Amino acid sequence: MKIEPITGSEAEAFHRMGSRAFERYNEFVDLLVGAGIADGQTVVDLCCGSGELEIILTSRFPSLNLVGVDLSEDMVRIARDYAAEQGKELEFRHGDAQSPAGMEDLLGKADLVVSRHAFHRLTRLPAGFDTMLRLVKPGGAILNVSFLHLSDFDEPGFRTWVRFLKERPWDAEMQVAWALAHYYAPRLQDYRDALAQAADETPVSEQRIWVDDQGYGVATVKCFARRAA
Amino acid sequence: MKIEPITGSEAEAFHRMGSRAFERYNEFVDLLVGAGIADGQTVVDLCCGSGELEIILTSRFPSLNLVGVDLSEDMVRIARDYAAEQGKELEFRHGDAQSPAGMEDLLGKADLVVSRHAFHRLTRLPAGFDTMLRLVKPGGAILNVSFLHLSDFDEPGFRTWVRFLKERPWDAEMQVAWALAHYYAPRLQDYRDALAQAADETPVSEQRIWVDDQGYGVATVKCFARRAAA
Ligand SMILES: Nc1ncnc2c1ncn2[C@@H]1O[C@H](CSCC[C@H](N)C(=O)O)[C@@H](O)[C@H]1O
Ligand SMILES: Nc1ncnc2c1ncn2[C@@H]1O[C@H](CSCC[C@H](N)C(=O)O)[C@@H](O)[C@H]1O
């Protein structure tokens, strides 16, 4: 079965690869800008991993109030060390994206709630979007970008997928993790269903889901919504 | 929780009341004329109820190709019998306004797609408008007129609401359903959001939401758009 967290040497390796390849976060940062991210806002990043996005965002936007959340304590610890390494004061938090638990003080407070390359791992996708919309304030936006199931790739997209898999500088284990993460990723319609389910509970004034590739290097699923005011 | 369909004897009763109050549709019929309705067009009515609009429209515009759709089979049942009773030839279908399922043959075919006093009942309002824009031809129009949430009534508007309820010739059980329908209605801004959303997915050349009362007897929300040309 699919595994949710990334732990131990897997996580150190995820952090080594990631923080050298900053370029590949640019797609996500650009969506945030399009989503209305701005100085002084409160931004919650669910499944924050080793903190790369947090370092990028604080560097670009020193004004932001950032809270990273991850289910893997090791990731939380790596992130804090990485923050210290970069001389930054960032809040990291142990937590499950599938529930508000441990984040009750953030309920209705985030200007933006976001997750990068993580929600495909969730056991209950609708619960992830539920947590996002409950954390975000009325009028605020949520953004998820995560992996698409292998069955929704067309021929050119799949060629690009295999080519991407080959061209990366990762080992046997980390190749398999990333491929397996697509084996178990939700389909496009699964994303649309999950977000629709979450919006039945917390109304949105806008929603949108699509698949493209604007820089990461394979197609990923974009899910955007704005909580109704 | 809010309910979508109107069923059984409540639908028989709905029909009994509507049957003898054609005048209450004049406001809606007048808006269709403003929307560009014309003889020989194909017109889909979503959430058609017991078919009163279809009887009125076929009488006023005899060669319109009218398709009524409703989630209540009993409403469909009623509508069909009522059309036969009136000696008219009219297609009624079972279906959900929140999706094109069962209406794929109408996709992109309607010159007008309309719904009267029903969209406030939908669980997913944006999907209602999506089905509307998808059923209409490029260059065609959509019109929804439906109920306003109680929170968007100003004082005079609300006084009217109470007075309308009082002086309607109908029983306790009917009043409550009509009141509850407003209790659960979208706010004005919810209508604006749901239509913009539907228009993000199917482009419009024109749209407009407003609130007034030109005949029905309370303020209702009007939603109009024209699908962009191909
Ligand atoms: N249910 C859950 N709640 C919170 N974090 C979770 C989670 N399931 C998996 N994760 C975390 O999701 C992350 C996937 S890797 C993505 C890390 C980071 N968002 C980035 O883009 O670089 C891991 O850190 C993993 O521990
Ligand atoms: N999701 C849905 N899809 C189709 N019809 C629906 C629906 N939700 C409610 N309805 C129908 O909406 C109608 C509301 S009563 C309005 C009837 C008619 N339009 C008229 O103006 O007289 C009922 O017949 C009910 O069954």
Side-chain angles (χ1 to χ4, degrees):
Chain A
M1 268 183 14
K2 72 172 144 189
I3 70 112
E4 276 188 19
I6 308 177
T7 68
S9 297
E10 211 178 346
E12 305 286 359
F14 182 93
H15 175 42
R16 279 193 291 285
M17 265 218 66
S19 50
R20 91 216 300 165
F22 264 42
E23 262 68 14
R24 68 138 188 157
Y25 291 82
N26 289 333
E27 178 164 22
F28 196 80
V29 176
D30 284 357
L31 290 173
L32 302 186
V33 165
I37 192 162
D39 295 58
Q41 284 182 346
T42 294
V43 176
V44 179
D45 182 19
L46 302 175
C47 314
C48 66
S50 46
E52 276 68 10
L53 181 56
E54 281 65 44
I55 296 319
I56 293 170
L57 295 176
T58 324
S59 296
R60 296 269 268 284
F61 306 91
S63 34
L64 284 169
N65 176 20
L66 255 54
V67 183
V69 189
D70 204 286
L71 181 64
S72 169
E73 207 81 77
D74 290 342
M75 286 285 202
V76 173
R77 282 312 209 286
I78 287 154
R80 289 169 176 153
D81 284 352
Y82 186 42
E85 175 191 300
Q86 299 298 315
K88 312 279 174 134
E89 303 252 320
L90 294 160
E91 196 186 334
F92 292 104
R93 210 179 268 217
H94 166 73
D96 199 309
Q98 300 158 128
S99 148
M103 293 172 270
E104 289 86 354
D105 61 314
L106 301 171
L107 289 168
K109 301 281 283 156
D111 297 296
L112 287 168
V113 189
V114 313
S115 191
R116 185 177 176 280
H117 297 194
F119 266 32
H120 60 271
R121 295 183 167 269
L122 272 28
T123 298
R124 279 165 185 193
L125 180 59
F129 292 112
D130 179 84
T131 303
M132 288 191 147
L133 293 169
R134 292 206 277 150
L135 290 168
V136 88
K137 68 174 64 162
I142 68 169
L143 178 68
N144 171 66
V145 184
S146 56
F147 299 170
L148 182 69
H149 190 250
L150 290 168
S151 70
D152 279 322
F153 284 86
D154 68 5
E155 173 169 349
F158 186 75
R159 282 175 184 273
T160 308
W161 190 86
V162 173
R163 287 182 64 269
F164 189 91
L165 180 50
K166 167 57 172 56
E167 177 164 38
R168 298 275 71 69
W170 41 33
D171 72 336
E173 261 62 352
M174 187 151 206
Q175 275 207 31
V176 172
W178 182 90
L180 260 192
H182 286 83
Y183 182 90
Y184 280 124
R187 296 179 278 101
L188 178 57
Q189 190 60 52
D190 297 328
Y191 282 102
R192 297 189 188 285
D193 292 348
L195 185 56
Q197 284 167 257
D200 290 340
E201 290 277 45
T202 315
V204 290
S205 65
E206 245 188 278
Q207 69 178 279
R208 192 190 272 113
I209 291 166
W210 70 101
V211 182
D212 64 10
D213 181 12
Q214 307 299 336
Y216 175 57
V218 299
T220 50
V221 186
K222 279 70 176 180
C223 320
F224 173 86
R226 169 149 341 255
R227 190 182 175 173
Chain B
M1 198 169 81
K2 88 192 177 196
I3 59 138
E4 296 207 355
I6 304 177
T7 57
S9 57
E10 190 186 9
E12 297 286 358
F14 182 100
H15 176 45
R16 279 193 286 276
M17 209 59 69
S19 290
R20 328 194 323 97
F22 275 17
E23 69 267 16
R24 301 252 221 96
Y25 298 82
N26 287 325
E27 178 177 16
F28 195 83
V29 168
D30 275 352
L31 292 160
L32 300 182
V33 167
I37 192 154
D39 216 330
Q41 288 179 338
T42 290
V43 175
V44 176
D45 183 21
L46 298 166
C47 313
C48 65
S50 45
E52 276 77 358
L53 181 58
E54 280 67 43
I55 296 319
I56 297 153
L57 291 183
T58 313
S59 300
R60 300 272 288 281
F61 310 93
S63 222
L64 264 287
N65 179 46
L66 259 46
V67 190
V69 186
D70 205 285
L71 179 69
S72 176
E73 196 68 55
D74 298 322
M75 286 290 196
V76 173
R77 188 188 74 231
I78 299 339
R80 292 196 210 269
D81 270 326
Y82 181 43
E85 168 189 291
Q86 302 288 315
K88 310 289 185 171
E89 307 184 307
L90 292 163
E91 185 190 339
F92 291 93
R93 291 163 91 125
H94 185 236
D96 194 323
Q98 297 158 133
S99 110
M103 299 177 275
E104 291 87 347
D105 60 311
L106 304 173
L107 280 171
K109 294 286 138 291
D111 299 294
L112 282 187
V113 188
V114 316
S115 185
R116 182 176 176 284
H117 299 185
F119 266 34
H120 62 265
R121 305 179 77 102
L122 301 177
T123 314
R124 289 165 184 186
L125 186 61
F129 290 116
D130 180 78
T131 300
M132 279 191 150
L133 289 177
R134 279 184 178 152
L135 291 169
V136 86
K137 304 208 292 230
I142 72 170
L143 184 78
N144 173 69
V145 178
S146 69
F147 294 173
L148 184 60
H149 190 247
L150 291 174
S151 68
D152 279 329
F153 282 90
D154 75 347
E155 173 179 350
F158 182 78
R159 286 176 162 286
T160 308
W161 191 86
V162 179
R163 286 182 36 257
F164 177 91
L165 192 53
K166 264 231 71 158
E167 82 189 296
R168 276 318 90 188
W170 62 42
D171 62 17
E173 292 74 44
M174 261 288 199
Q175 289 169 66
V176 169
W178 183 91
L180 272 179
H182 286 90
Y183 183 92
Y184 280 121
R187 300 171 290 113
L188 175 57
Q189 190 57 54
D190 297 322
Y191 283 106
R192 296 195 187 283
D193 294 345
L195 183 49
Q197 200 150 337
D200 290 340
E201 311 190 57
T202 304
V204 294
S205 68
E206 188 182 348
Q207 54 169 294
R208 191 194 272 109
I209 315 309
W210 70 99
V211 174
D212 65 7
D213 180 12
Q214 306 302 331
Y216 174 55
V218 306
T220 52
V221 180
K222 281 77 171 176
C223 312
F224 172 87
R226 176 166 316 276
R227 184 171 179 175

